[PDB]
PDB file of C-alpha atoms and ligand atoms in Angstrom:
ATOM      1  CA  UNK A   1       9.339   1.075 -21.674  1.00  0.00           C
ATOM      2  CA  UNK A   2       5.770  -0.229 -23.015  1.00  0.00           C
ATOM      3  CA  UNK A   3       5.146   2.605 -25.460  1.00  0.00           C
ATOM      4  CA  UNK A   4       2.085   4.475 -24.233  1.00  0.00           C
ATOM      5  CA  UNK A   5       2.550   5.234 -20.639  1.00  0.00           C
ATOM      6  CA  UNK A   6      -0.500   4.276 -18.514  1.00  0.00           C
ATOM      7  CA  UNK A   7       0.463   6.715 -15.889  1.00  0.00           C
ATOM      8  CA  UNK A   8       0.299   9.518 -18.421  1.00  0.00           C
ATOM      9  CA  UNK A   9      -3.016   8.331 -20.008  1.00  0.00           C
ATOM     10  CA  UNK A  10      -4.573   7.667 -16.363  1.00  0.00           C
ATOM     11  CA  UNK A  11      -3.558  11.346 -15.355  1.00  0.00           C
ATOM     12  CA  UNK A  12      -5.329  12.697 -18.396  1.00  0.00           C
ATOM     13  CA  UNK A  13      -8.420  10.913 -16.893  1.00  0.00           C
ATOM     14  CA  UNK A  14      -7.992  12.894 -13.850  1.00  0.00           C
ATOM     15  CA  UNK A  15      -6.426  10.218 -11.707  1.00  0.00           C
ATOM     16  CA  UNK A  16      -3.103  10.975  -9.680  1.00  0.00           C
ATOM     17  CA  UNK A  17      -0.934   7.990 -10.829  1.00  0.00           C
ATOM     18  CA  UNK A  18      -0.469   4.523 -12.054  1.00  0.00           C
ATOM     19  CA  UNK A  19       2.363   2.988  -9.937  1.00  0.00           C
ATOM     20  CA  UNK A  20       4.314   0.140  -8.868  1.00  0.00           C
ATOM     21  CA  UNK A  21       6.056  -1.726  -5.906  1.00  0.00           C
ATOM     22  CA  UNK A  22       9.802  -1.557  -6.180  1.00  0.00           C
ATOM     23  CA  UNK A  23      12.960  -1.305  -4.310  1.00  0.00           C
ATOM     24  CA  UNK A  24      16.821  -0.891  -4.801  1.00  0.00           C
ATOM     25  CA  UNK A  25      17.694  -4.421  -6.139  1.00  0.00           C
ATOM     26  CA  UNK A  26      14.942  -4.079  -8.859  1.00  0.00           C
ATOM     27  CA  UNK A  27      15.809  -0.460  -9.576  1.00  0.00           C
ATOM     28  CA  UNK A  28      19.349  -1.544 -10.254  1.00  0.00           C
ATOM     29  CA  UNK A  29      18.858  -4.513 -12.639  1.00  0.00           C
ATOM     30  CA  UNK A  30      17.262  -5.046 -16.072  1.00  0.00           C
ATOM     31  CA  UNK A  31      14.429  -2.753 -17.180  1.00  0.00           C
ATOM     32  CA  UNK A  32      12.553  -1.895 -13.816  1.00  0.00           C
ATOM     33  CA  UNK A  33      13.916   1.777 -13.615  1.00  0.00           C
ATOM     34  CA  UNK A  34      13.369   2.689 -17.291  1.00  0.00           C
ATOM     35  CA  UNK A  35       9.855   1.304 -17.111  1.00  0.00           C
ATOM     36  CA  UNK A  36       8.972   3.336 -13.852  1.00  0.00           C
ATOM     37  CA  UNK A  37      10.497   6.359 -15.707  1.00  0.00           C
ATOM     38  CA  UNK A  38       8.453   5.799 -18.990  1.00  0.00           C
ATOM     39  CA  UNK A  39       5.294   4.298 -17.880  1.00  0.00           C
ATOM     40  CA  UNK A  40       4.554   4.939 -14.273  1.00  0.00           C
ATOM     41  CA  UNK A  41       4.224   7.815 -11.864  1.00  0.00           C
ATOM     42  CA  UNK A  42       4.348   6.464  -8.267  1.00  0.00           C
ATOM     43  CA  UNK A  43       6.364   3.832  -6.266  1.00  0.00           C
ATOM     44  CA  UNK A  44       5.887   1.839  -3.121  1.00  0.00           C
ATOM     45  CA  UNK A  45       8.737   0.275  -1.317  1.00  0.00           C
ATOM     46  CA  UNK A  46       8.200  -3.378  -1.589  1.00  0.00           C
ATOM     47  CA  UNK A  47       9.985  -4.335   1.532  1.00  0.00           C
ATOM     48  CA  UNK A  48      12.471  -1.563   2.529  1.00  0.00           C
ATOM     49  CA  UNK A  49      10.254   0.496   4.867  1.00  0.00           C
ATOM     50  CA  UNK A  50       8.658  -2.581   6.652  1.00  0.00           C
ATOM     51  CA  UNK A  51       9.614  -2.600  10.358  1.00  0.00           C
ATOM     52  CA  UNK A  52      11.646  -5.752  10.273  1.00  0.00           C
ATOM     53  CA  UNK A  53      13.699  -4.210   7.306  1.00  0.00           C
ATOM     54  CA  UNK A  54      14.217  -1.078   9.367  1.00  0.00           C
ATOM     55  CA  UNK A  55      14.808  -2.269  12.806  1.00  0.00           C
ATOM     56  CA  UNK A  56      15.327  -6.159  13.100  1.00  0.00           C
ATOM     57  CA  UNK A  57      17.412  -5.560  15.986  1.00  0.00           C
ATOM     58  CA  UNK A  58      16.047  -2.997  18.556  1.00  0.00           C
ATOM     59  CA  UNK A  59      17.780   0.230  18.321  1.00  0.00           C
ATOM     60  CA  UNK A  60      19.841  -0.470  15.158  1.00  0.00           C
ATOM     61  CA  UNK A  61      18.169   1.316  12.389  1.00  0.00           C
ATOM     62  CA  UNK A  62      18.581   0.395   8.580  1.00  0.00           C
ATOM     63  CA  UNK A  63      17.526   3.260   6.578  1.00  0.00           C
ATOM     64  CA  UNK A  64      19.732   2.778   3.408  1.00  0.00           C
ATOM     65  CA  UNK A  65      17.426   0.869   0.899  1.00  0.00           C
ATOM     66  CA  UNK A  66      14.481   3.100   2.072  1.00  0.00           C
ATOM     67  CA  UNK A  67      16.514   6.307   1.671  1.00  0.00           C
ATOM     68  CA  UNK A  68      17.515   4.970  -1.871  1.00  0.00           C
ATOM     69  CA  UNK A  69      14.045   4.626  -3.028  1.00  0.00           C
ATOM     70  CA  UNK A  70      12.925   7.915  -1.858  1.00  0.00           C
ATOM     71  CA  UNK A  71      15.911   9.479  -3.695  1.00  0.00           C
ATOM     72  CA  UNK A  72      15.071   7.612  -6.795  1.00  0.00           C
ATOM     73  CA  UNK A  73      11.386   8.854  -6.560  1.00  0.00           C
ATOM     74  CA  UNK A  74      12.412  12.418  -5.969  1.00  0.00           C
ATOM     75  CA  UNK A  75      14.919  12.535  -8.676  1.00  0.00           C
ATOM     76  CA  UNK A  76      12.394  11.054 -11.286  1.00  0.00           C
ATOM     77  CA  UNK A  77       9.258  12.967 -10.123  1.00  0.00           C
ATOM     78  CA  UNK A  78       7.440   9.798  -8.866  1.00  0.00           C
ATOM     79  CA  UNK A  79       5.328  10.198  -5.781  1.00  0.00           C
ATOM     80  CA  UNK A  80       5.676   7.668  -3.093  1.00  0.00           C
ATOM     81  CA  UNK A  81       3.397   5.653  -0.760  1.00  0.00           C
ATOM     82  CA  UNK A  82       5.126   4.706   2.397  1.00  0.00           C
ATOM     83  CA  UNK A  83       4.725   1.149   3.402  1.00  0.00           C
ATOM     84  CA  UNK A  84       3.944   0.222   6.178  1.00  0.00           C
ATOM     85  CA  UNK A  85       4.203   1.364   9.725  1.00  0.00           C
ATOM     86  CA  UNK A  86       2.260  -1.007  11.889  1.00  0.00           C
ATOM     87  CA  UNK A  87       1.797  -4.512  10.616  1.00  0.00           C
ATOM     88  CA  UNK A  88       1.691  -7.955  12.269  1.00  0.00           C
ATOM     89  CA  UNK A  89       3.899  -9.469   9.580  1.00  0.00           C
ATOM     90  CA  UNK A  90       7.471  -8.771   8.855  1.00  0.00           C
ATOM     91  CA  UNK A  91       7.848  -7.301  12.378  1.00  0.00           C
ATOM     92  CA  UNK A  92      10.816  -7.460  14.446  1.00  0.00           C
ATOM     93  CA  UNK A  93      10.858 -10.209  17.244  1.00  0.00           C
ATOM     94  CA  UNK A  94      11.518  -7.557  19.917  1.00  0.00           C
ATOM     95  CA  UNK A  95       8.401  -5.846  19.203  1.00  0.00           C
ATOM     96  CA  UNK A  96       6.379  -9.120  18.872  1.00  0.00           C
ATOM     97  CA  UNK A  97       7.958 -10.055  22.338  1.00  0.00           C
ATOM     98  CA  UNK A  98       6.511  -6.980  24.271  1.00  0.00           C
ATOM     99  CA  UNK A  99       4.221  -7.977  26.880  1.00  0.00           C
ATOM    100  CA  UNK A 100       3.082  -4.692  28.462  1.00  0.00           C
ATOM    101  CA  UNK A 101       0.317  -2.408  26.704  1.00  0.00           C
ATOM    102  CA  UNK A 102       1.980   0.902  27.747  1.00  0.00           C
ATOM    103  CA  UNK A 103       5.368  -0.365  26.672  1.00  0.00           C
ATOM    104  CA  UNK A 104       3.769  -1.083  23.271  1.00  0.00           C
ATOM    105  CA  UNK A 105       2.082   2.149  23.332  1.00  0.00           C
ATOM    106  CA  UNK A 106       5.196   4.084  23.642  1.00  0.00           C
ATOM    107  CA  UNK A 107       7.161   1.871  21.100  1.00  0.00           C
ATOM    108  CA  UNK A 108       4.404   2.539  18.433  1.00  0.00           C
ATOM    109  CA  UNK A 109       4.708   6.367  19.011  1.00  0.00           C
ATOM    110  CA  UNK A 110       8.496   6.218  18.829  1.00  0.00           C
ATOM    111  CA  UNK A 111       8.566   3.978  15.607  1.00  0.00           C
ATOM    112  CA  UNK A 112       5.804   5.799  13.802  1.00  0.00           C
ATOM    113  CA  UNK A 113       7.227   9.434  14.707  1.00  0.00           C
ATOM    114  CA  UNK A 114      10.751   8.426  13.831  1.00  0.00           C
ATOM    115  CA  UNK A 115       9.970   6.787  10.480  1.00  0.00           C
ATOM    116  CA  UNK A 116       7.397   9.411   9.255  1.00  0.00           C
ATOM    117  CA  UNK A 117       9.558  12.159  10.540  1.00  0.00           C
ATOM    118  CA  UNK A 118      12.576  11.001   8.559  1.00  0.00           C
ATOM    119  CA  UNK A 119      10.812  11.537   5.232  1.00  0.00           C
ATOM    120  CA  UNK A 120       8.485  14.603   6.361  1.00  0.00           C
ATOM    121  CA  UNK A 121       7.358  16.354   3.277  1.00  0.00           C
ATOM    122  CA  UNK A 122       8.747  13.676   0.890  1.00  0.00           C
ATOM    123  CA  UNK A 123       6.114  10.838   0.993  1.00  0.00           C
ATOM    124  CA  UNK A 124       2.591  11.702  -0.129  1.00  0.00           C
ATOM    125  CA  UNK A 125       0.790   9.001   1.744  1.00  0.00           C
ATOM    126  CA  UNK A 126       1.445   6.430   4.441  1.00  0.00           C
ATOM    127  CA  UNK A 127       0.048   2.933   5.116  1.00  0.00           C
ATOM    128  CA  UNK A 128      -0.067   3.578   8.644  1.00  0.00           C
ATOM    129  CA  UNK A 129      -1.822   0.344   9.572  1.00  0.00           C
ATOM    130  CA  UNK A 130      -1.900  -2.699   7.437  1.00  0.00           C
ATOM    131  CA  UNK A 131      -4.134  -5.859   7.415  1.00  0.00           C
ATOM    132  CA  UNK A 132      -5.699  -5.180  10.945  1.00  0.00           C
ATOM    133  CA  UNK A 133      -9.050  -7.132  10.103  1.00  0.00           C
ATOM    134  CA  UNK A 134     -10.218 -10.643  10.194  1.00  0.00           C
ATOM    135  CA  UNK A 135     -12.307 -11.860   7.302  1.00  0.00           C
ATOM    136  CA  UNK A 136     -15.307 -11.225   9.300  1.00  0.00           C
ATOM    137  CA  UNK A 137     -14.446  -7.683  10.077  1.00  0.00           C
ATOM    138  CA  UNK A 138     -13.388  -8.166  13.626  1.00  0.00           C
ATOM    139  CA  UNK A 139      -9.795  -7.042  14.692  1.00  0.00           C
ATOM    140  CA  UNK A 140      -6.969  -9.542  13.710  1.00  0.00           C
ATOM    141  CA  UNK A 141      -5.004 -11.104  16.631  1.00  0.00           C
ATOM    142  CA  UNK A 142      -1.629  -9.768  16.826  1.00  0.00           C
ATOM    143  CA  UNK A 143       0.711  -8.131  19.303  1.00  0.00           C
ATOM    144  CA  UNK A 144      -0.991  -4.943  18.693  1.00  0.00           C
ATOM    145  CA  UNK A 145      -4.737  -5.826  19.107  1.00  0.00           C
ATOM    146  CA  UNK A 146      -3.723  -8.342  21.855  1.00  0.00           C
ATOM    147  CA  UNK A 147      -1.936  -5.731  24.048  1.00  0.00           C
ATOM    148  CA  UNK A 148      -3.980  -2.545  23.034  1.00  0.00           C
ATOM    149  CA  UNK A 149      -7.324  -3.555  21.387  1.00  0.00           C
ATOM    150  CA  UNK A 150      -8.431  -1.034  18.860  1.00  0.00           C
ATOM    151  CA  UNK A 151      -6.415   1.585  20.644  1.00  0.00           C
ATOM    152  CA  UNK A 152      -3.316   0.867  18.634  1.00  0.00           C
ATOM    153  CA  UNK A 153      -4.878   2.339  15.645  1.00  0.00           C
ATOM    154  CA  UNK A 154      -5.698   5.753  17.274  1.00  0.00           C
ATOM    155  CA  UNK A 155      -2.012   5.728  18.689  1.00  0.00           C
ATOM    156  CA  UNK A 156      -0.431   5.027  15.288  1.00  0.00           C
ATOM    157  CA  UNK A 157      -2.426   7.405  13.166  1.00  0.00           C
ATOM    158  CA  UNK A 158      -2.215  10.431  15.629  1.00  0.00           C
ATOM    159  CA  UNK A 159       1.454   9.802  15.865  1.00  0.00           C
ATOM    160  CA  UNK A 160       1.805   9.776  12.140  1.00  0.00           C
ATOM    161  CA  UNK A 161      -0.210  13.090  11.585  1.00  0.00           C
ATOM    162  CA  UNK A 162       2.049  14.971  14.031  1.00  0.00           C
ATOM    163  CA  UNK A 163       5.135  13.531  12.390  1.00  0.00           C
ATOM    164  CA  UNK A 164       3.863  14.882   9.030  1.00  0.00           C
ATOM    165  CA  UNK A 165       0.539  17.028   8.909  1.00  0.00           C
ATOM    166  CA  UNK A 166       0.627  16.936   5.304  1.00  0.00           C
ATOM    167  CA  UNK A 167       0.858  13.198   4.494  1.00  0.00           C
ATOM    168  CA  UNK A 168      -2.318  11.441   3.673  1.00  0.00           C
ATOM    169  CA  UNK A 169      -2.588   8.553   6.236  1.00  0.00           C
ATOM    170  CA  UNK A 170      -4.015   5.394   4.861  1.00  0.00           C
ATOM    171  CA  UNK A 171      -5.522   1.942   6.299  1.00  0.00           C
ATOM    172  CA  UNK A 172      -4.474  -0.774   4.037  1.00  0.00           C
ATOM    173  CA  UNK A 173      -6.054  -4.225   3.524  1.00  0.00           C
ATOM    174  CA  UNK A 174      -6.674  -7.174   1.309  1.00  0.00           C
ATOM    175  CA  UNK A 175      -9.817  -8.949   0.510  1.00  0.00           C
ATOM    176  CA  UNK A 176     -11.840  -5.614   0.144  1.00  0.00           C
ATOM    177  CA  UNK A 177     -12.818  -6.907  -3.091  1.00  0.00           C
ATOM    178  CA  UNK A 178     -16.518  -7.610  -3.026  1.00  0.00           C
ATOM    179  CA  UNK A 179     -19.247  -5.162  -1.692  1.00  0.00           C
ATOM    180  CA  UNK A 180     -20.831  -6.467   1.577  1.00  0.00           C
ATOM    181  CA  UNK A 181     -18.190  -8.910   2.194  1.00  0.00           C
ATOM    182  CA  UNK A 182     -17.704  -9.015   6.000  1.00  0.00           C
ATOM    183  CA  UNK A 183     -14.328  -7.618   5.965  1.00  0.00           C
ATOM    184  CA  UNK A 184     -15.413  -4.502   4.052  1.00  0.00           C
ATOM    185  CA  UNK A 185     -18.396  -4.118   6.416  1.00  0.00           C
ATOM    186  CA  UNK A 186     -16.293  -4.385   9.453  1.00  0.00           C
ATOM    187  CA  UNK A 187     -13.669  -1.894   8.069  1.00  0.00           C
ATOM    188  CA  UNK A 188     -16.301   0.634   7.101  1.00  0.00           C
ATOM    189  CA  UNK A 189     -17.769   0.429  10.632  1.00  0.00           C
ATOM    190  CA  UNK A 190     -14.504   0.778  12.595  1.00  0.00           C
ATOM    191  CA  UNK A 191     -13.055   3.345  10.139  1.00  0.00           C
ATOM    192  CA  UNK A 192     -16.101   5.501  10.480  1.00  0.00           C
ATOM    193  CA  UNK A 193     -16.216   5.315  14.067  1.00  0.00           C
ATOM    194  CA  UNK A 194     -12.405   6.138  14.438  1.00  0.00           C
ATOM    195  CA  UNK A 195     -12.853   9.053  12.131  1.00  0.00           C
ATOM    196  CA  UNK A 196     -15.761  10.263  14.202  1.00  0.00           C
ATOM    197  CA  UNK A 197     -13.608  10.239  17.212  1.00  0.00           C
ATOM    198  CA  UNK A 198     -10.947  12.397  15.520  1.00  0.00           C
ATOM    199  CA  UNK A 199      -8.473   9.776  14.385  1.00  0.00           C
ATOM    200  CA  UNK A 200      -6.794  11.247  11.303  1.00  0.00           C
ATOM    201  CA  UNK A 201      -7.554   8.581   8.742  1.00  0.00           C
ATOM    202  CA  UNK A 202      -7.502  10.146   5.251  1.00  0.00           C
ATOM    203  CA  UNK A 203      -7.606   7.058   2.968  1.00  0.00           C
ATOM    204  CA  UNK A 204      -8.563   3.347   2.668  1.00  0.00           C
ATOM    205  CA  UNK A 205      -6.083   1.194   0.610  1.00  0.00           C
ATOM    206  CA  UNK A 206      -7.612  -1.846  -1.137  1.00  0.00           C
ATOM    207  CA  UNK A 207      -4.567  -4.273  -1.921  1.00  0.00           C
ATOM    208  CA  UNK A 208      -6.725  -6.126  -4.584  1.00  0.00           C
ATOM    209  CA  UNK A 209      -4.613  -9.433  -4.748  1.00  0.00           C
ATOM    210  CA  UNK A 210      -7.200 -11.023  -7.052  1.00  0.00           C
ATOM    211  CA  UNK A 211      -7.888 -14.441  -8.757  1.00  0.00           C
ATOM    212  CA  UNK A 212      -9.482 -14.780 -12.153  1.00  0.00           C
ATOM    213  CA  UNK A 213     -12.853 -13.296 -12.173  1.00  0.00           C
ATOM    214  CA  UNK A 214     -12.173 -11.041  -9.162  1.00  0.00           C
ATOM    215  CA  UNK A 215     -12.261  -7.770 -11.220  1.00  0.00           C
ATOM    216  CA  UNK A 216     -16.037  -8.135 -11.331  1.00  0.00           C
ATOM    217  CA  UNK A 217     -16.400  -7.245  -7.653  1.00  0.00           C
ATOM    218  CA  UNK A 218     -13.951  -4.325  -7.393  1.00  0.00           C
ATOM    219  CA  UNK A 219     -16.523  -1.547  -8.520  1.00  0.00           C
ATOM    220  CA  UNK A 220     -19.107  -2.435  -5.923  1.00  0.00           C
ATOM    221  CA  UNK A 221     -16.492  -2.626  -3.184  1.00  0.00           C
ATOM    222  CA  UNK A 222     -14.837   0.619  -4.088  1.00  0.00           C
ATOM    223  CA  UNK A 223     -18.349   2.249  -4.114  1.00  0.00           C
ATOM    224  CA  UNK A 224     -19.008   1.012  -0.695  1.00  0.00           C
ATOM    225  CA  UNK A 225     -15.489   2.054   0.651  1.00  0.00           C
ATOM    226  CA  UNK A 226     -16.226   5.653  -0.792  1.00  0.00           C
ATOM    227  CA  UNK A 227     -19.184   5.989   1.527  1.00  0.00           C
ATOM    228  CA  UNK A 228     -16.706   6.220   4.405  1.00  0.00           C
ATOM    229  CA  UNK A 229     -15.648   9.813   5.378  1.00  0.00           C
ATOM    230  CA  UNK A 230     -12.205   9.192   4.021  1.00  0.00           C
ATOM    231  CA  UNK A 231     -10.840  11.679   1.534  1.00  0.00           C
ATOM    232  CA  UNK A 232      -9.161   9.136  -0.750  1.00  0.00           C
ATOM    233  CA  UNK A 233      -9.156   5.519  -1.775  1.00  0.00           C
ATOM    234  CA  UNK A 234      -6.421   3.624  -3.733  1.00  0.00           C
ATOM    235  CA  UNK A 235      -5.827   0.272  -5.249  1.00  0.00           C
ATOM    236  CA  UNK A 236      -2.577  -0.463  -3.558  1.00  0.00           C
ATOM    237  CA  UNK A 237      -0.968  -3.780  -4.365  1.00  0.00           C
ATOM    238  CA  UNK A 238      -2.816  -4.998  -7.533  1.00  0.00           C
ATOM    239  CA  UNK A 239      -2.178  -8.301  -9.122  1.00  0.00           C
ATOM    240  CA  UNK A 240      -4.357 -10.876 -10.767  1.00  0.00           C
ATOM    241  CA  UNK A 241      -3.646 -14.589 -11.341  1.00  0.00           C
ATOM    242  CA  UNK A 242      -3.102 -15.219 -14.891  1.00  0.00           C
ATOM    243  CA  UNK A 243      -3.363 -11.395 -15.653  1.00  0.00           C
ATOM    244  CA  UNK A 244      -6.588 -11.715 -17.581  1.00  0.00           C
ATOM    245  CA  UNK A 245      -7.253  -8.734 -19.755  1.00  0.00           C
ATOM    246  CA  UNK A 246     -10.933  -8.601 -18.689  1.00  0.00           C
ATOM    247  CA  UNK A 247     -10.159  -8.447 -14.940  1.00  0.00           C
ATOM    248  CA  UNK A 248      -7.511  -5.850 -15.336  1.00  0.00           C
ATOM    249  CA  UNK A 249      -9.461  -3.532 -17.296  1.00  0.00           C
ATOM    250  CA  UNK A 250     -12.404  -3.957 -14.888  1.00  0.00           C
ATOM    251  CA  UNK A 251     -10.380  -2.945 -12.111  1.00  0.00           C
ATOM    252  CA  UNK A 252      -9.001   0.242 -13.871  1.00  0.00           C
ATOM    253  CA  UNK A 253     -12.692   1.061 -14.831  1.00  0.00           C
ATOM    254  CA  UNK A 254     -13.681   0.720 -11.337  1.00  0.00           C
ATOM    255  CA  UNK A 255     -11.142   3.171 -10.248  1.00  0.00           C
ATOM    256  CA  UNK A 256     -12.233   5.496 -12.900  1.00  0.00           C
ATOM    257  CA  UNK A 257     -15.879   5.093 -11.679  1.00  0.00           C
ATOM    258  CA  UNK A 258     -15.141   6.332  -8.132  1.00  0.00           C
ATOM    259  CA  UNK A 259     -13.996   9.867  -7.677  1.00  0.00           C
ATOM    260  CA  UNK A 260     -12.229   9.135  -4.114  1.00  0.00           C
ATOM    261  CA  UNK A 261      -9.966   6.595  -5.908  1.00  0.00           C
ATOM    262  CA  UNK A 262      -6.772   8.553  -6.574  1.00  0.00           C
ATOM    263  CA  UNK A 263      -4.738   5.877  -8.383  1.00  0.00           C
ATOM    264  CA  UNK A 264      -3.538   2.262  -8.869  1.00  0.00           C
ATOM    265  CA  UNK A 265      -0.359   0.454  -7.785  1.00  0.00           C
ATOM    266  CA  UNK A 266       0.445  -2.933  -9.032  1.00  0.00           C
ATOM    267  CA  UNK A 267       2.482  -5.110  -6.893  1.00  0.00           C
ATOM    268  CA  UNK A 268       5.787  -5.318  -9.114  1.00  0.00           C
ATOM    269  CA  UNK A 269       6.646  -4.936 -12.850  1.00  0.00           C
ATOM    270  CA  UNK A 270       7.660  -8.225 -14.183  1.00  0.00           C
ATOM    271  CA  UNK A 271       5.923 -11.587 -13.552  1.00  0.00           C
ATOM    272  CA  UNK A 272       9.678 -12.842 -12.770  1.00  0.00           C
ATOM    273  CA  UNK A 273       9.751 -10.642  -9.532  1.00  0.00           C
ATOM    274  CA  UNK A 274       6.195 -11.112  -8.305  1.00  0.00           C
ATOM    275  CA  UNK A 275       5.681 -12.438  -4.791  1.00  0.00           C
ATOM    276  CA  UNK A 276       3.167 -14.646  -6.607  1.00  0.00           C
ATOM    277  CA  UNK A 277       5.303 -15.562  -9.500  1.00  0.00           C
ATOM    278  CA  UNK A 278       3.786 -19.006 -10.303  1.00  0.00           C
ATOM    279  CA  UNK A 279       0.438 -17.130 -11.347  1.00  0.00           C
ATOM    280  CA  UNK A 280       2.076 -14.604 -13.782  1.00  0.00           C
ATOM    281  CA  UNK A 281      -0.135 -12.027 -12.414  1.00  0.00           C
ATOM    282  CA  UNK A 282       1.539  -8.687 -13.399  1.00  0.00           C
ATOM    283  CA  UNK A 283       1.592  -6.463 -16.397  1.00  0.00           C
ATOM    284  CA  UNK A 284       4.984  -7.161 -17.780  1.00  0.00           C
ATOM    285  CA  UNK A 285       6.250 -10.649 -18.670  1.00  0.00           C
ATOM    286  CA  UNK A 286       9.702 -12.027 -17.658  1.00  0.00           C
ATOM    287  CA  UNK A 287      11.339 -10.325 -20.552  1.00  0.00           C
ATOM    288  CA  UNK A 288       9.920  -6.941 -19.459  1.00  0.00           C
ATOM    289  CA  UNK A 289       7.720  -6.749 -22.445  1.00  0.00           C
ATOM    290  CA  UNK A 290       4.083  -5.314 -21.758  1.00  0.00           C
ATOM    291  CA  UNK A 291       1.433  -8.104 -21.468  1.00  0.00           C
ATOM    292  CA  UNK A 292      -2.037  -7.952 -23.125  1.00  0.00           C
ATOM    293  CA  UNK A 293      -3.438  -6.868 -19.853  1.00  0.00           C
ATOM    294  CA  UNK A 294      -1.122  -3.716 -19.998  1.00  0.00           C
ATOM    295  CA  UNK A 295      -2.086  -3.049 -23.727  1.00  0.00           C
ATOM    296  CA  UNK A 296      -5.804  -3.665 -22.820  1.00  0.00           C
ATOM    297  CA  UNK A 297      -5.373  -0.890 -20.236  1.00  0.00           C
ATOM    298  CA  UNK A 298      -3.602   1.455 -22.645  1.00  0.00           C
ATOM    299  CA  UNK A 299      -6.770   0.802 -24.988  1.00  0.00           C
ATOM    300  CA  UNK A 300      -9.317   1.978 -22.427  1.00  0.00           C
ATOM    301  CA  UNK A 301      -7.568   4.960 -21.187  1.00  0.00           C
ATOM    302  CA  UNK A 302      -6.981   6.154 -24.819  1.00  0.00           C
TER     303      UNK A 302
HETATM  304 CL1  LIG B 401       0.024  14.761 -21.010  1.00  0.00          CL
HETATM  305 CL1  LIG B 402      21.016  -6.409 -15.689  1.00  0.00          CL
HETATM  306 CL1  LIG B 403      16.640  -7.322  19.441  1.00  0.00          CL
HETATM  307 CL1  LIG B 404      -1.061  18.307  -2.636  1.00  0.00          CL
END
């Protein structure tokens, strides 16, 4: 508990949530659960719903940790962002080893249908595809693009939609942090085309893994993304090297500046548990005390 809940404060501004990545280990130790209960309104499984976590060995599903997180969120009234169905990283070898396009086509459908279907009605939004773009806005090379070209996106989103018609379906990526950056332009172009073709893409997630000074670009980037006929945007994996108060407040102000942005998720609670731990990039220190960046956000939401 940081005293003054940023989720409560941001809801009063008209946003949906301020949330965090988490999972069972975190929830069961130290102050992670208590902070989520007091200060946050949303959770994303940091790893438990990635395909390698769920199905490292083909046909052998591993739902436990994912189920646990969903239960925690439901019992504590936090919304959930499912993360993530189709991603080149943290991918089972057996999927990577597929050589035939139609094989993959049907594997994607089965995986997407099964995972979304399991939590139908419980998960508000899904990162259906993750990190599919190169830095210049072309499609990233992976088993998905290699075998199916852009078609894997249509396949994944349509399967997700039918598995839960009420879920908000997102495409998620990093380096969507500066207006007119190649990746932003490419994403805008492709997502617009896919939407026009009937692909059900409801949201764009901007991961926002930033370095110092990176907050100055967030506003322009979100404003550009907002021009895409998605319904929602979100900052999905926020962290910033050194957690500068200026950059953190600028990102929050950017969200507040764009109607389509529904909320912010930071990528973890305590610096100690960050995937970029050496850069102290989160809102709570190793002792689970709020850092100046947290307090500064409280100040401007006040
Ligand atoms: Cl209130
Ligand atoms: Cl403990
Ligand atoms: Cl296997
Ligand atoms: Cl709703």
